Amino acid sequence: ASRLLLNNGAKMPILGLGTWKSPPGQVTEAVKVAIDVGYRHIDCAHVYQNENEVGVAIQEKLREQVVKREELFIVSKLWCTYHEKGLVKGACQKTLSDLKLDYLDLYLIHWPTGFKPGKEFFPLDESGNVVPSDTNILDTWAAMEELVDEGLVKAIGISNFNHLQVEMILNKPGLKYKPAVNQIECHPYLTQEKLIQYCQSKGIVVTAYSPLGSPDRPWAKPEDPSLLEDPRIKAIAAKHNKTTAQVLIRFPMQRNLVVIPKSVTPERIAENFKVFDFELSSQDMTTLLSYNRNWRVCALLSCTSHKDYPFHEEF
Ligand SMILES: NC(=O)c1ccc[n+]([C@@H]2O[C@H](COP(=O)([O-])OP(=O)(O)OC[C@H]3O[C@@H](n4cnc5c(N)ncnc54)[C@H](OP(=O)(O)O)[C@@H]3O)[C@@H](O)[C@H]2O)c1
Ligand SMILES: O=C(O)Cc1nn(Cc2nc3cc(C(F)(F)F)ccc3s2)c(=O)c2nccnc12
């Protein structure tokens, strides 16, 4: 229906609101609107630099009695500069303090790559290479497991992990908690068929990020493809009397993925939720899958020699 079962027994809403690039001055209103029109899943991160303002909106709607806390599914992520085992708890507590919550529904390792700890989110050397930390995936995972044991988070997962990285965790000797979710970039130009098959086969729920192709991403080039403007996808939308955005959001839902489109624009927040009253056909699905180009929008050149860089592998 509208939620997917996780390995902890919780039900994760299949549609959530993304908040990357939602400025602090606009995100509070965005979240308020989203909760009013039915969103019950918000995707957050420390690196988005807006958790306080998301937290404001959630607090206001709890106090207004619009929703109760157990009806909300709040996700955040551990940033790359906090992979050291001793920094993980503090990072989670900082996120909880900013969001004004006492627990998260889901906390992800944001990227498999640890960066040098410090004030800078992207510590670069003078030649522009990211500076790694001497952290590894398995030790970071162990610190994430402690958060569940301490009741700060209900479920833990990963983001931007390739299948070998997922495998590494699943095969961890003394594994305490299996990853619940892998959050990955997924859209018609990067359909992720092998990694989705892998993760679903392993009972890991997949969340599709950048489902509209992140047209506001800060490194977009003029000559880059644009999903929302793809005349072929416009044609599918017109046939169903829907928008291109609604098709792009429905697409992952029919693959049994969670999807988290971002908007700060109230009309679009509402538009993006109106995706439960139509179905894409088998032909439409096949057609959208056929647009795959292995075109990835979320990666940084500056990280490509990190030992744990995820996107050298086929999947
Ligand atoms: N785990 C990770 O590493 C990671 C990476 C990337 C993204 N994410 C998550 O996934 C979320 C979504 O990805 P994203 O932010 O990259 O991009 P996206 O959701 O693919 O696209 C957002 C862009 O599309 C616009 N838009 C939204 N609804 C629209 C509609 N109905 N019609 C036309 N334009 C529309 C937004 O404009 P306005 O906001 O101005 O309306 C914004 O410019 C993020 O916000 C974040 O929560 C996670
Ligand atoms: O991380 C997100 O959820 C979205 C996001 N993506 N990016 C592109 C990035 N790409 C990467 C790539 C790596 C990698 F794992 F080394 F591959 C590690 C960290 C990053 S962050 C930003 O530069 C970035 N900068 C600020 C805030 N968010 C971002």
Swiss-Prot record:
The modification N6-acetyllysine is found at K94, K221, K262. NADP(+) binds at residues 9-18, 210-272. Belongs to the aldo/keto reductase family. Cys-298 may regulate the kinetic and inhibition properties of the enzyme, but does not participate in catalysis. Tolrestat inhibits retinal reduction. The gene is AKR1B1. PANTHER family: ALDO/KETO REDUCTASE. The active site is at Y48 (proton donor). It catalyses: an alditol + NADP(+) = an aldose + NADPH + H(+); all-trans-retinol + NADP(+) = all-trans-retinal + NADPH + H(+); 9-cis-retinol + NADP(+) = 9-cis-retinal + NADPH + H(+); 13-cis-retinol + NADP(+) = 13-cis-retinal + NADPH + H(+). InterPro entries: AKR (IPR020471), Aldo/ket_reductase_CS (IPR018170), NADP_OxRdtase_dom (IPR023210), NADP_OxRdtase_dom_sf (IPR036812). It comes from Homo sapiens (Human). The modification Phosphoserine is found at S2. CDD domains: AKR_AKR1B1-19. This is Aldo-keto reductase family 1 member B1. Its EC number is 1.1.1.21, 1.1.1.300, 1.1.1.372, 1.1.1.54. It is found in: Cytoplasm.
